[model samples]
Target: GLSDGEWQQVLNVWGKVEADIAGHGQEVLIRLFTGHPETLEKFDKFKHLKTEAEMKASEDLKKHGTVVLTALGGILKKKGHHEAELKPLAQSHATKHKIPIKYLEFISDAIIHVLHSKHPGDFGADAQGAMTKALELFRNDIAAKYKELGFQ
Candidate 1:
């Protein structure tokens, strides 16, 4: 939904933030858990992680978080044009993870919060709007396959 400049802004931001994949990925999941504590219920595997530090320290978060961010980077790079490429991801989230829509939506929320947090005075409404739109598409792509997923 964004033009080259808007797309580039997100791209540039991702480059900087994703430069330290582990650090940001660690914080992203923590942020999600911190802001939406209920989400912790969905990640049964991470239930043992008592605190943010514990969550970030686990090999699980370190490994899977990077993969998640990498997947996100791929989706965002195409500016909503390559959405169908996410179909498998959608399936996995539903069939494999059994995550509800809200938690999936929280992923975008947490990512945007993390991204916008860096901007301070820079990520205003237009920036925010573009990001929200990008995420809306992101959410829709993942949400579509929910019913087809029968929970393993």
Candidate 2:
């Protein structure tokens, strides 16, 4: 676990990213963290800030969520068993949504390629930084795309 100060720093960075990405037409990117299944569950149970769009999008992207989370879990698993802990959650989502495991596997492979290419380090502190950088790059690209589409 991070120290209180470290956690606060992470939250500050995440807040900035979320603020920058919010309300753009790029629903998928904005929803990546906020509308994530686990995050949404916590938000719904405690925060009561569930927007209609977030709920609907979560339902719509249930399958894709399974794919993405499963892929991430698999990537993490190769580094350590602890990383595989999320696999069951991802598998449960896939099964509940009737998503094909093979499809998730394919998406997992694609995610692995992208993640590994951008951050070749072993899954450690350095890899975490690389992942953060990669996510930021994705946000920037999506933000630019939204701008091109005249999102104001």
Candidate 3:
């Protein structure tokens, strides 16, 4: 279990992130696609975009990314009591989207990478630890949903 202090640390860093949700969220998905190119196949709307420039320019991608980041902000604000919040999302992703739990790990890591790159000075060890643990909690909850639904 994470302490209140840890939640505060993550929320503090997230305050900066809230300022540029579009840029940061798009960058996170860009980073995710860059690291795992095959994941692109999952996004029909984005699959035609070959270059990073194209991905950056697509309004659809930006809008989708914004939604993703905004949801994450909501999750963080809930302070780890997000199981109720996460359940429907988990069900949608597991059933309709058929998105693997591994993609969640990739996205979580990309979030950290983007955060560290954007706020190297402020996102130090304590913040990083808190972020990682919080994301782990997210992953765990979602994976539980995947298991319950009999999805891999």
The number of the candidate with the highest TM-score is 3
lDDT of 1 at 130: 68
Q: Which regions of candidate 3 fall more than 4 Å away from where they truly are? A: none
Please give the lDDT score for candidate 1: 0.76
lDDT of every predicted structure (CA atoms): 0.76, 0.38, 0.90
lDDT by residue (43-128, candidate 2, tens digit) is 23323435646644543344444444444434333332332444444445444433333332333234334334333563345444
lDDT of 3 by residue, 34-143 (tens): 88998888888888989999988888888999999899889889998898789999999999888999999999999999988887787889989999999999899999
> In model 2, where is the ten-residue run with the lowest total lDDT?
20-29
| CA error at residue 145 for candidate 3, angstroms | 0.6
Which pairs of residues clash in candidate 3, taking residues 3 or more apart in a chain or in different chains? none
**How would you encode candidate 1's per-residue C-alpha lDDT over 1-152 as one tens digit per residue?**
56777776677677766778776777778889888888887777887778877886688887778888888888898787775668878877787777788887887888778766765776667667766777787787666666556443
| Global fold similarity of model 3 (TM-score) | 0.96
Worst lDDT run of 10 residues, candidate 3, spans 115-124
Top lDDT model:
3
Query: Worst ten-residue run, lDDT, model 1?
Result: 143-152
Please state the error at residue 26 of candidate 2 in Å. Answer: 20
TM-score of each: 0.82, 0.28, 0.96
